[model samples]
Structure formats: C-alpha cells, structure tokens
Target: APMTEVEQKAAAGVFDDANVRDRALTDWDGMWQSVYPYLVSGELDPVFRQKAKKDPEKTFEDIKAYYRKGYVTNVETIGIENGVIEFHRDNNVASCKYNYAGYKILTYASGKKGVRYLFECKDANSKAPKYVQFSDHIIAPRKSAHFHIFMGNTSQQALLQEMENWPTYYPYQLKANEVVDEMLHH
Candidate 1:
C-alpha cells in the first residue's frame, strides 16, 4: 500500500517516562540506531543467548553468516528501526526482518522496504536516537499505521516460536524490532 498515515497520537514525553519497548515510538530510528549490529545480525545480541543455547542445533557463527546475506552490497542501504513496516511475506526471497512481535511477516503481495512506502530518507534522522535510554523490547510507535503498531507479541509465540499467522513467520521469531533510519527511492 502507501506510507499511509494513521493517527493514534499520544503524548510525547509520556513515553520518556516508560521503557522504550513499553511505549509506542514516535520516531523509530531510535529503535535500531543503537542496535544496527544486532539487527544486521540480530543473532549477535546477547538477548538471544538463551535461544541459541536452548537450541542444541543453533550457533551464532552460523546464524550470523546466514543473516549477512541480508546485507545490501552493490545495492544501497537503509537505516534500521526507521519505520519500514512490512506486512507481506515471501520466504522464498532472501530478505531480512526481525524476531518476535510474533506471527510476524504476513501473507500478502507487498513490496520491499521502500518498495511499499516509496520515500527514502537522505537527510532524515539517519542516526539512531542518540542519548536516549529505554527498554525497546516493549515500546512501539506512538503515531503509527497498522503495520507500524509493534504489538507486544499477543500470540502464544510472543517470545520466540515457530508460531505462524496471517503473516508468514520465518526470520522474525522474536521481537527484534528493526526499523530503518532512512531509505532511497527515485
């Protein structure tokens, strides 16, 4: 669809009082700005230590190698946690998203990050929200569209599970919310 704007505006500072993961984000750049490395290879974050250990068959090295394919090479780049709400799924494609916010990635013929929204930021916030501290594990967006709403994994697989739903679930098995700082179009 479009970078369609839906209004669910809330007080700004209200979020500052709560944790990042608990409040709806006003600017998503803050979400991934601090964790691009993890988002680049979400497996790197210590948060998944238990997940890897729990899975006797999982390893970070192997997982990192797999996620690295998500990198854009001769291609351009976009910022993470910068609001690239995706609601379509095509696991056949070698794309990268997050974990959690379960039953993630939907089954619709949607477009790529900007392929759907069309606006790519050049001079946008580009940098993660510097000097901000909050537990992003719970915060969502303040003013958001349906896709922008990072609900706290209401599914039974809220934490991390093969739990699938309207959206196809492959990579996004946790709540590794990764927004982009910006994108490029035209």
Candidate 2:
C-alpha cells in the first residue's frame, strides 16, 4: 500500500531526528556513512556511465570476461604462497587473496614507508577502487595496512535483501520523492 501524506511526513521526521538532516542536508560525510556500507559490500549496485541495468546473470558473465581479458599494468608479481599473492609497486609491496567464495578480493600492504593503500576490487577492472594515505607520524614503518573487497553477486543480493528489510531503510522512500521532485521541479 502507498504511504499517506501523514505517514510520509512522519517518516521524514524520523529521518530528521536520526541526524538525517545534518548528514543528508548539511554534511556529505553523513550521507556517505549511511550508504557506504551497502556500496562497499555490493548491496547497492552502481549504474555505470555507459551501461544500462543488466540482468544479474549477464552482469556476472561480463565480469568474468573482463577478468580473463583484462590485465593489471604497472603491477609486478613477487610471489604466491598459501593462497596469498604478493606483489610490489615501486617501494611498496602488497599481498592479496581471494575469498573462499572466489568472489571477493582482499589486499594488504607492508613496507618501511608504512602501508597506506586500501583497495576494493568489485568488478573486473577494479571498479571505484578506494584508497587511503596516512602521514608518517600516524603509522610506524613496516606496519601492515589491510582492506577488504566484496564481489557484487549472490553475496550482494543477500546483503541487499537484509538491508532492505531494516526499518531504517528509509532512503528508498526519499528516493521516490526525489524522483517526483525532479519531474515537477523541471
């Protein structure tokens, strides 16, 4: 059933109290905090600039094709042992391993300069890779930096279902409003 205007207002009020106003309206960081988990976990699929919504089966197929055909440039493979693959980039060396499901990829870096890169490879070409850099004082030399990557497939679907069922998942309601506003505003 469609929510009445009063219900919609009440929902908006809940969002407002949950720091939604401060986060969604005032600070972009808050917005990211609310949605970053879903994004990184592949619960929220991104629409590519040139591609339209693809069937889940087709999406998986395309990803496999890209992985087999694509190449990682500027990466020097050092060794692979115990299910971990180690490689180097200039003075930085890193190790990565695929998850048991063979979908997600996790990487860690260690060096005298202090590992500072965290990357999440969602698709074949490392979609929207995330990174972080720390000042010298923050982390001592030879420390390890680790990051997790989630493959956007069955695992993501499971997460999406869970997140959608959460009572706090009010963004979908707001999204409907935004769509209407966009049409009416213009």
Candidate 3:
C-alpha cells in the first residue's frame, strides 16, 4: 500500500528540527466543521471498532474507552474558526479567542522530536481554559485529517508537560476503515 501523506513526510524527515515549521490553528481552515458532526452524533463508533481490530491485545472496549477520554470525555463538541475555539461541554459552552503563542519542540523518550503548536487564550468565556495546544503529527501547514488536543488552565509551559488525556478528533468524511488506516500511518 502507498504510504499516507504523513508517512511520506516522516520518511522525508520533514519533522526533523532542520525542516519543521511553525503553524497556527488558522492554517486548518474549516477543520472544526469537518469533525464536529461525528463527535456529536456518535458517527465515529464504527471507526473505533475498526481500530480495535488492529491489535489483539486491545479489545473493542479498550479502544472505545481510550477515545472516550481523548475525544468526548471532557467536551462533546468543538468549533474552531479564525482565531477562536468553542468547546461545547455538558454544562456550558466556552468560547476562547486564541493567538499563536509559539511552538514547542519536544524530545520524546524514543529520541524523536515533535512540535506542539500552542495557542494562548487572549479572550474567553470564564469557563475557557488558559491555553490550548495541538499535535497533528505534522509540523508544517497542511490540512489536518485528525488531531490530539491538550488544553488546560495551566500556563503554556505547564500544558505542554501534560502527557495524559489528549482529546483526539477526526474528520467525519473518513470511513471507519480509513480512520483505522490513518491511525496506523500516525
């Protein structure tokens, strides 16, 4: 099978320090619209099922549970446009306007480095967090098919240190099988 775009980039060492570039959330125009429906309507269940099949050690429940934490465990819906992000939660809908604070290049335990784009909340609902960050497995400007998000009331530096509970999302247009394939590529 042909490698996905991300895999090809990885092969080309685009994520290497020499080549990695900074990107803002605005670079992913319309991404919120692409992913919002699936999260709200439970349309991603089949994708979760397909992902579970990839590893015998991980069952369907395990996969679902993982996504539940990383996807909708905290917020049920997300809307991003321009420089603003809206998080629809069970209690209240929080809206936060963000500015591209900077980028963090993290060295993983595997000796590989990855960049996390940070957004500082310049204005927001009282419920909104202090900062938001995104990891899409790409360091350059490209339409993201999916992303793992980290957000909190902590400072940008502290939020970057958060290793657990990254809420993930994917576009609704992708099929369950295709979503599984995307995971493998990541």
Candidate 4:
C-alpha cells in the first residue's frame, strides 16, 4: 500500500527541522472544539488500543498509560475562538484571553530541536493556567490536525525548559484506525 500523507511527511523528515517560524495563537482558532469531544466521550480509547498493537511486547495498559500521561489535561472541554480559550471543567467555565509570548527553540538529547510557541494568559479565572505552550510538529502556517500542549503557572521561560509533561490532542473527526495509522508512521 502507498504511504499516507502523514507517513510521507514522517519519511521525508519534514517534522524534524531545527529552525521553525513563529505563529500566532489565532492560527489555532477551531482546534480545541475539534478534539474536545473525543477526549471526554471515550472515543480516543480505540485509538490508544490501536497504538498498543504497535508493540506486541507491551500490554494494552502500558500503551494506554503512556497516552494517558500525554492526554490527561484536567479541562473537561475547551473552545478556542479569536485567540480566546474557553475552558470548561466541573461545571465551571473560564474564558481566558491570552497574548502570544513568542517562541522558544529547545535542543533535545537526540540532537534535534523543537520549537514551542508560548502564550501568556492575560485574563482568566484562577482555574486557568497562567502560561501555555504548544508544539504541533509544524514549522510554518498550517492547520494542525493535532498538537502537544504544556500548561502551567510557571513562567514562559520556565515552561520552555520544562520537559516532563505534554498533554496531546487530536481531532475527533478522524477515525481511530487512520489516527493510529498516522501514529505508526509519525
């Protein structure tokens, strides 16, 4: 079978570039709404199961745990519009306004560099994070099918260096099989 779009990019190393351009928060306008349902509705479990199949030596729980670490943001739902992030959790909704804090380029142990775009919360309730960073594996302007997010009260500089946790998200519109197929190659 021919390689899918994601496989082609992975094979071409298009996602491994060290130099990345900056992007505005508005570039991610509809992202949150697209992935929110899947996370809350258990629709992402099947995708996690398919990922588990990639490693026969690993149990399903192992794979799920790995993904859980990346997908376990406490926010029950998220909606982004015009650069504003609306977060819903435990029946409380907080509308957060944010400003672009610039981008940070970090070197990894594998001699690869990753760029994370930072955003600082300008206005929000106590429930919202003071700083958020995003990595979409993209260097240019393009709609992201998924992204890895880091949210915290730490400074943008601090979050830039913090490598421990990154919550991941993908569009609910994509079927689990295709999503897993992309993960296999991505």
Candidate 5:
C-alpha cells in the first residue's frame, strides 16, 4: 500500500528535527543537513553542468544514469566499473536508492562513509508533511554513543558565515551535496 496520510506525516516529521533546524559542528548530521538547499533551489554545482559533457569517463552522467537504481552514484560518476551497474541492491557497504513517489535518494554507507543528494514531489495530503525529521542516530560521529554532541547554529546567517570561514563552501556545493546525500540515509 502507498504511504497513508498518518504514516506520511510521521515520515515527514522525521526530517524536521536536527536535520533541518540545528547547526552544531560536532553535529554529525549537521553536515548532512545542509544538502537540500543546493538541490531544491536548482543550484546544482557548475560541475554538474559539465559532468555529462566531459569525456564520459569519470563524468557526472555516469552517476546520473545510475542514480536511485541502488548503485552508489559516487562511484558510478567515477565510471560504472563494477560490471554494468547491477540493477539491484546487494548488501553493499555503499549504494544509492531512488524512489520518486516516496524517497528521492538514499545513500546507504557504513563505517567511514560519505554523503550525496536529490528531491521529492508534494503529496496530496496535508497531514503528510512536506518532509520528515527524526533525531536518533539520524547522523552521528564515529562514536556509537555520542550523546555529548549538541545542535549548533547552522541557521542561514551562521551557515553563510561558515562559508566565509570554510572556503570549500563557495564552489564545492555539489560535492557537499553528494557527500551529505550519500551519508545519512543509510
């Protein structure tokens, strides 16, 4: 069955927690939280504009075609080398999941993993939130029990300031998006 209104609301609410409102550096999820802006705003990195145009190898199209098909887009963009991008998820440590009517992207990784990105459509039901938010192990550091980490000020002003302090933020938005997108959904 499709996600019922009640279930959808619960799922959307899962994304509203630390994922959307906090900005603490120690916040493992905080890094993952900043991904949506670049995508939903249609500001994909300049690199994306050039990915499909490149030599086709180590190109972005490699990943695009593989997206949501359960293959790690990160690796696919580098070139589908593991035998034609298998059409199924196989308990791999790293992989991507693309579900349109439901989730857009799921970067399932482990141990020292990375992040990636994507989007969604509006549900017909209002109870079904525009998105979801939850704060368990949604995102965390290497420490299995990192209850010490606190949510910081990743608010727009603070995040922009972070960009000022963290030069990588200026042009690496795509990379940032990919990294975060690939990390948390696991």
Candidate 6:
C-alpha cells in the first residue's frame, strides 16, 4: 500500500531535521558520483542484464553481489555513537540515522546508477514499520554485512508484505531477443 497522508507527513518530519537530511543526501550523492564511472564503463557484470529479465532469484543474487563488493571495501561508517550511518559505493547505497531530542531518524538509498532510490523512517511511528532494502553494506574487507528483518511484528509484517508484493505490482518485462543477445554476449 502507498503511504497514507498521515504517514507521509510524519515521514517528512524525520527528514526535515537539517543534520539528518544533510548527511543522508550527501551520502547518497557521494556514493552515486563515486560509482557512476564504474557503472558506465560496463564494470557491471553482463549477468545483471540477464538477471533483469524478470528473474527474481537471479536479480536478487545480482543485487546481493553488488552489495558485497560495494560495501565490503568502499563503504564507510563515520559516526557510530551519534547513530549508524553508512555509505556504499558499489550499489549506490547510503544511509544515516539521528537519535536526539526524543526523535529518531533513519534514511537509506537504493537501486542502480541511473535510478537511485531513497527512503526515511522516523520515530513518530518508529513502531509503524518501514521497508527499506534487504541488503547491508560492509564497511571493511573480510567483514560481512547481513540483511535480516523480522516480519511477524505489526510494523515488520506490513513492510514485508509490501515487499513480497513488489514484483507482482511492478514487474519488468524484457524483450526475449534482448535477453538472448545479452546472454550470448556474456
């Protein structure tokens, strides 16, 4: 379901904070600008093209690999005690959190180069549950970043259900010939 007006209003408040907004936005822009060169240069595996052909499993794996490489080495976490904020280059993922003045703000970026996605979750309804991406970015090499969100709770369930229905709601259709061509090229 689309966010209700009330939800949108509350969501906006989380981002309205200047410190949170600046960090989240800057991380996103920096991650994208830093990774654009690689993306445009075809550093991306051709497998991504094949996986984009409406293959959920393959597409998810591709996304996973992007996170693994992107965050494992390039991503960084600057201020931990202030809250958790991460910047990932490979997948163009950036996220920040601010917990102060009885408010909690969280923001993250997702998607590929030409199409960057972002979302914010705040304390007004911190229990209201929000669905961001499912992958975590690693800050250093040899460390693992895992994605795990519980779905049974009120908020978590709502978010998980929405995510489950995403493919059905926004299915991407690729030309067979194109898929074949990309596959062969690979």
Clashing pairs in 3: 70-167, 70-168
Q: Which of the predicted structures, 2 or 6, would earn the higher TM-score when compared with the native? A: 6
lDDT accuracy of residue 16 in candidate 6: 36
Per-residue lDDT of 6-65 in model 3, one digit per residue for the tens?
Answer: 656753335567666778786654544233345446666666676777667878777766
- The residue-level lDDT of candidate 6 at 133 comes to 29
Against the true structure, candidate 1 reaches a TM-score of 0.25
TM-scores, each model vs. reference? 0.25, 0.19, 0.71, 0.71, 0.20, 0.23
Whole-model lDDT per candidate: 0.27, 0.26, 0.68, 0.66, 0.26, 0.31
Better of 3 and 6 by lDDT: 3
lDDT of 4: 0.66
- The TM-score of candidate 3 is 0.71
| Candidate 1 residue lDDT tens string, 1-117 | 322122111111122223223332233332112223443555344434534666889986664444344331221112235233222212221112332221122222332111011
Candidate 5 lDDT over 24-65, as tens digits, reads 222222212222244334444344445556556656644433
Top model by lDDT, which number?
3
Question: Could you tell me the TM-score of candidate 5?
Answer: 0.20
Better of 5 and 6 by TM-score: 6
What CA root-mean-square deviation does each model show from the true structure? 16.5, 20.2, 4.5, 4.6, 19.7, 17.7
Q: Give the local distance difference test score of model 5.
A: 0.26
Positional deviation of 183 in candidate 1, in angstroms?
A: 24
For the record, the alpha-carbon RMSD of candidate 6 to the native fold, in angstroms, is 17.7
- Give per-residue CA lDDT, model 2, range 98-159, as digits (tens): 22221111121321221111222224443221221111111211221111122122334343
Candidate 6 TM-score to native: 0.23
Better of 3 and 6 by TM-score: 3
**Residue 152 Cα positional deviation in candidate 3, in Å, after optimal superposition:** 0.6
Clashing pairs in model 6? none
lDDT (C-alpha) at residue 103 in model 1? 19
Residue-level error in angstroms, candidate 4, position 2? 15
- lDDT ranking, high to low: 3, 4, 6, 1, 5, 2
